[PDB]
Design a protein around this ligand. Structure first.
Ligand SMILES: N[C@@H](CCC(=O)N[C@@H](CS)C(=O)NCC(=O)O)C(=O)O
Ligand SMILES: N[C@@H](CCC(=O)N[C@@H](CS)C(=O)NCC(=O)O)C(=O)O
Lengths: 207, 207
């Protein structure tokens, strides 16, 4: 299966760790957006939204990092813990996946991207929204050892990719006890952790 | 099961149509955000992210509309077509769910809400991104009759909740033939269609 990605990308790193978790080997396809490789006619045929990560598994094209992670868990995973079949348990996992996309990473991007690509001054309003997002995550972790329960799931993997990004950007995770502790634990227990660590160094080249 | 909602809210309507599709009755609990009812202690105890929709099913509290929709489908659904178990088919539906949230609705909200509620000037670039989101959906709908595959799924229901809102907001959907055709067909066929139409009228009360 081909994996169109960029090493420093969080959504890409989330899939990489999930693939490691289920023992699936990804045929890496470095896709340089600055060379318009995602806009090649061949790529558009695979993914009209022309975005990475994009996975192609024996003719089946799929994008949206979290959808890819769930796909790999359902089709190639054997350990129910990573993505529980029980509706209730799976629902908490799914809610956290949406949280990661629409709240945690979304606010991170809203605050840092303008400073990185537009050279705009740090926006106070968006800084607080980002802070509120980590606060939520901190609350989600109160009591439980993992983001969506008591066992490592793909929700921890995608949130790790995101939080490891907050880290390299210089965000103060230490002011969120549960997040900081979970991060330290998960950064050492996540399958493919070494790939994630190598990847953030590429993202670091943005600051 | 309790359903904390507001009729005009798109994410809430997505859950209402999904519930109707699976024969699940929802005890409606109007939660007026303008009156700050989403921050009442009792509600924060159930949902610390203080957002609607929030579902409580025999003690189990859940938020994030699309996670509620899939939960209702997995636990109470009996028509595999609504949310296919096959990993690949499921993956296509799931990618569309993330599309609906992170691309289609996200851009709609970022463009209109700051104007309607915060009374801020329109943001031209955000308008452009919004057009790009509908364009993507238009392409997805080229050939394919439903948002995901050749049958109505929960992806059609949430996209209807989102697109119907684009409609009342005055966005020119007509310029996207495949989106417009799909909408013309689905706004009638969809389970809970009448609920959604009534809900958008309550949303209109903001224009
Ligand atoms: N929500 C998506 C985000 C995908 C995304 O933002 N992709 C970026 C790379 S970080 C991209 O390909 N941008 C170029 C484009 O969309 O044309 C996911 O989780 O996969
Ligand atoms: N991604 C969420 C969006 C939830 C959302 O935006 N909820 C709004 C109502 S439309 C809300 O409760 N806002 C007030 C708040 O979050 O405090 C979903 O699909 O449920």
């Amino acid at each position: 299966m081909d994996f169109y990605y960029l090493p420093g990308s969080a959504p890409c790193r989330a899939v990489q760790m999930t693939a490691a978790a289920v023992g699936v080997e990804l045929n890496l396809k470095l896709t340089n957006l600055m060379a318009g490789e995602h806009m090649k006619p061949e790529f558009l045929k695979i993914n009209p939204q022309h975005c990475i990560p994009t996975l192609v598994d024996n003719g089946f094209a799929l994008w949206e990092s979290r959808a890819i992670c769930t796909y790999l868990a359902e089709k190639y995973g054997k350990d129910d813990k990573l993505y529980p079949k029980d509706p209730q348990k799976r629902a908490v996992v799914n809610q956290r996946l949406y949280f990661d996309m629409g709240t945690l990473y979304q606010r991170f991007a809203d605050y840092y991207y303008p400073q990185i690509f537009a050279k705009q001054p740090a926006n106070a309003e968006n800084e607080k929204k980002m802070k509120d997002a980590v606060d939520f995550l901190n609350t989600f972790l109160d009591g439980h050892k993992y983001v969506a329960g008591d066992s490592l799931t793909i929700a921890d993997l995608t949130v790790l990719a995101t939080v490891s990004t907050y880290d390299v950007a210089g965000f103060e995770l230490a002011k969120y006890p549960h997040v900081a502790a979970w991060y330290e634990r998960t950064r050492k227990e996540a399958p493919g952790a070494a790939i994630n660590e190598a990847g953030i160094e590429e993202f670091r080249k943005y600051f």
